Design a protein around this ligand. Structure first.
Ligand SMILES: CCCCCCC[C@H](C)CCC[C@H](C)CCC[C@H](C)CCC[C@@H](C)CCC[C@H](C)CCCOP(=O)(O)O[C@@H]1C[C@H](CO)[C@@H](O)[C@H](O)[C@@H]1O
Ligand SMILES: CCCCCCCCCCCCCCCC(=O)OC[C@@H](O)CO
Ligand SMILES: *[C@@H]1O[C@H](CO)[C@@H](O)[C@H](O)[C@H]1NC(C)=O
Ligand SMILES: CCCCCCCCCCCC
Lengths: 105, 277
């Protein structure tokens, strides 16, 4: 009390080109409390080798985390960012739109 | 004009027997330090993260932080009786200082409880937040009466040790913190805005520092529909921004995205839409 729901944004570091090394980012922000499960997914499975920033928070005390992983896209592969949090009835999966990314203004 | 150094802590009390303690140090938005809870030691994230401080000074600080994290955790777990109704709960601390180009430094130590302001340190005195009633009041009594030497330690750290450290840290890191990094840009289609309409997307990524200008263009004419998103972080100290444009069917040929940034100076990026439309 109070409890704030994470905002989830997914975007790549470089242009999405099949066969070209790239970085996939998931920026998860505006949540409270800090306990959270964030995973990057490749075809539904947690990507085991990822990096994440240490926990930090904004002026309003809401938390944020940046996740990133090196990946090489192809036409068949589907990437996502999945988040579970006390504010979430069921884990939320935010699919990476290759052309648009998946942002929340 | 204004630069900050923040040491933050997050204390997560799961139950009467289990808590987590986390913390880190930040130069503006750049993380410069971590904390290893396994070993109770500072993590220096950059070759220049020691600033101008000696190893002996940093060792003093490391022992102070290990002792603070452990002792705060245990005193809260003691004073939090049996409860288990209050559990779980979370305490956040944001302490540090600011260097200002024309004035004296600022120092601060602010505490939140379950995401709301609880109390803050004002020079000599722990002051309850007007917005957090009883509890804030109670804690502040104790902090002001029982822990009275810890208080002068805190004052000295935020008012004297922190600005000295920050000055030396900016100096050690000067050829990183003043860097200029040029972005790249690329175009894509976006989700349909409606029948007979298209969405063009201009992605701009890898720039530092954060100020940036992006406009969709037809020749030299800036386009009304340009809409910028939020400036989002990349790993390794650069940023990302998306600029979209909705366009009518049969009108996208000839459009371009134009990017201005300090790292370019008179060589704006201009990218032409070449289809997917
Ligand atoms: C934590 C995350 C770390 C992230 C990495 C950060 C790494 C990074 C490089 C750190 C550099 C930071 C810069 C240089 C400065 C930043 C200050 C920060 C903004 C303010 C934060 C103050 C809190 C956190 C400490 C709490 C005080 C203790 C709680 C004091 C407790 C007791 O101390 P005390 O002094 O009273 O001891 C007694 C004394 C008296 C006589 O005085 C004796 O009689 C008696 O016997 C005792 O010895
Ligand atoms: C020595 C290392 C760091 C020192 C930091 C000082 C620790 C202070 C501990 C704070 C615990 C205070 C919680 C007490 C809860 C309480 O007092 O409850 C109020 C209600 O009883 C009002 O009626
Ligand atoms: C407290 O929480 C920890 C972490 O979930 C758990 O391992 C431990 O069993 C709990 N202790 C209790 C409920 O007494
Ligand atoms: C239910 C117990 C709540 C405890 C409030 C935590 C206050 C910690 C402030 C200490 C700053 C040094």
């Amino acid at each position: 009390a109070i409890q704030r729901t994470p905002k989830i944004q997914v975007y790549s570091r470089h242009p999405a080109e099949n066969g070209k090394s790239n970085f996939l980012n998931c920026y998860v922000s505006g949540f409270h409390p800090s306990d959270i499960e964030v995973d990057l997914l490749k075809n539904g499975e947690r990507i085991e080798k990822v990096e994440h920033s240490d926990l930090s928070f904004s002026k309003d005390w809401s938390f944020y985390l940046l996740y990133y992983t090196e990946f090489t896209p192809t036409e068949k592969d589907e990437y996502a960012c999945r988040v579970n949090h006390v504010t979430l009835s069921q884990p939320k999966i935010v699919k990476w739109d290759r052309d648009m990314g998946s942002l929340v203004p | 004009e204004h630069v900050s150094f923040h040491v933050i802590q997050i204390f997560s009390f799961v139950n009467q027997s289990w808590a987590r303690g986390q913390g880190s140090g930040w130069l503006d938005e750049l993380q410069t330090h971590g904390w290893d809870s396994e070993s109770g030691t500072i993590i220096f994230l950059h070759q220049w993260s020691k600033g101008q401080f000696s190893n002996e000074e940093l060792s003093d600080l490391e022992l102070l932080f290990r002792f603070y994290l452990f002792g705060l955790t245990r005193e809260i777990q003691d004073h939090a009786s049996q409860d288990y109704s209050k559990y779980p709960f979370e305490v956040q601390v944001k302490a540090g200082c600011e260097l200002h180009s024309g004035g004296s430094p600022e120092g601060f130590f602010q505490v939140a409880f379950n995401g709301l302001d609880l109390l803050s340190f004002q020079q000599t005195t722990w002051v309850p937040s007007p917005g957090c009633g009883s509890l804030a009041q109670s804690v502040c009594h104790l902090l002001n009466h029982q822990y009275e030497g810890v208080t002068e330690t805190v004052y000295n750290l935020i008012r004297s040790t922190c600005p000295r450290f920050l000055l030396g840290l900016l100096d050690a890191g000067k050829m990183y913190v003043h860097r200029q990094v040029r972005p790249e840009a690329w175009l894509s289609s976006g989700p349909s805005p409606g029948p007979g309409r298209l969405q063009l997307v201009c992605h701009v990524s890898g720039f530092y520092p954060k100020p940036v200008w992006v406009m969709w263009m037809r020749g030299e004419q800036e386009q009304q529909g340009t809409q910028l998103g939020d400036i989002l972080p990349n790993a390794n100290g650069t940023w990302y921004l998306r600029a979209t444009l909705d366009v009518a069917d049969g009108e996208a040929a000839g459009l371009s995205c134009r990017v201005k940034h300090s790292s370019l100076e008179g060589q704006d990026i201009i990218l032409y839409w070449r289809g997917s439309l």
